[PDB]
Amino acid sequence: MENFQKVEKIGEGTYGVVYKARNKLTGEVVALKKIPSTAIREISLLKELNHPNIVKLLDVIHTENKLYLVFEFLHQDLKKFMDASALTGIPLPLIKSYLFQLLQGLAFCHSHRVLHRDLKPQNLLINTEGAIKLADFGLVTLWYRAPEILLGCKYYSTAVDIWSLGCIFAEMVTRRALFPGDSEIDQLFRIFRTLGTPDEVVWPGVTSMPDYKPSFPKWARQDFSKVVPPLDEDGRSLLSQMLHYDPNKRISAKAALAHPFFQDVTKPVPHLRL
């Protein structure tokens, strides 16, 4: 630990604060996160989870009741990049490359029985080479929370990550959060108001979910062409499948990678102001 120089606070992760540091010895620039014995094994399983689209966990330093996670340093996160392009908009070719990379990253996690659980623009990091990576794997914002989680599902699947990514995809396209809920019920009702209140017809077993209530107002599904205009039909087709109420009907990361939408995917480079 005495081997690091805090450079500046580059944010506050969900489980602790994150700083930019200079390895006092090797001089390398990294990201330090100031954070049970089960979670110590837990996060050591992460050290082996390496992929081009997953922020590298360089090291773990457990010391005097303080847990420190050393990560590879990426200057910008997606939330900050979306604000900076909020007037012009991220070019579609770039939106497509990012989604593709993230789906590749998710596909890798999910094939290893690892879920993210808390995907959001803030935990997605980008670099000048046009790459995007997943950061902050869960072990206050509900905008990207899948409906089965909101309805009390304790043993939810990897599909929750597809839901969250579908929400981020739609946000990159419209430059407005899809379902900006301010409460558990506001979030759920915002989803219901747009995709229609779920029932036994579209989601078998929903009415048996822990927090489901027959008293939920019954809204109808809205025109989907009104949800993410002016996204093309290939993209709208893919988003609709990522936003399916039924977690087992929801498109998988691997399968998503085979959708015609990525037929012309490329790897353009952003224009960051670091």
Ligand X SMILES: NC1=NC(=O)C(C2CCNC(=O)C3=NC(Br)=C[C@H]32)=N1
Residues in contact with ligand X by CB under 6 A are 10-11, 13, 18, 31, 33, 55, 71-74, 77, 122-123, 125, 135-136
Catalytic residue among 59, 83, 118, 234: 118
Report, in Å, the least distance between residue 123 CB and ligand X.
5
Distance in angstroms (rounded) separating the CA atoms of residues 41 and 59: 13
59 is in an annotated binding site: no
Least distance in angstroms from the C-beta of 69 to ligand X: 6
Residue 13 marked as a ligand binder: yes
Mark the breaks in the chain: residue after which each occurs, C to N over 2.5 Å. Answer: 35, 139
> With respect to ligand X, which residue has the nearer C-beta, 28 or 186?
28
Using the minimum distance from each CB to ligand X, give the nearer residue, 13 or 181: 13
33 labelled binding-site residue: yes
Q: Which long-range contacts (CB under 8 A, 24 or more apart) does 187-192 make?
A: 187/142, 187/143, 187/145, 187/150, 188/147, 188/150, 188/151, 188/216, 189/216, 189/217, 189/219, 191/147, 191/150, 192/216, 192/217, 192/219
Q: Select 13 or 166, whichever has its Cβ closest to ligand X.
A: 13
120 marked ligand binding residue: yes
Q: How far is the CB of 119 from ligand X (least distance, A)?
A: 12
Closer residue to ligand X, CB minimum distance, 75 or 254:
75
**Active site annotation includes 234:** no
Is-contact 57 13, C-beta < 8 A? no
Angstrom distance (rounded) from CA 119 to CA 125: 12
Positions marked active-site: 118
Binding residues for ATP, by number, are 10-18, 33, 72-74, 77, 120-123, 136
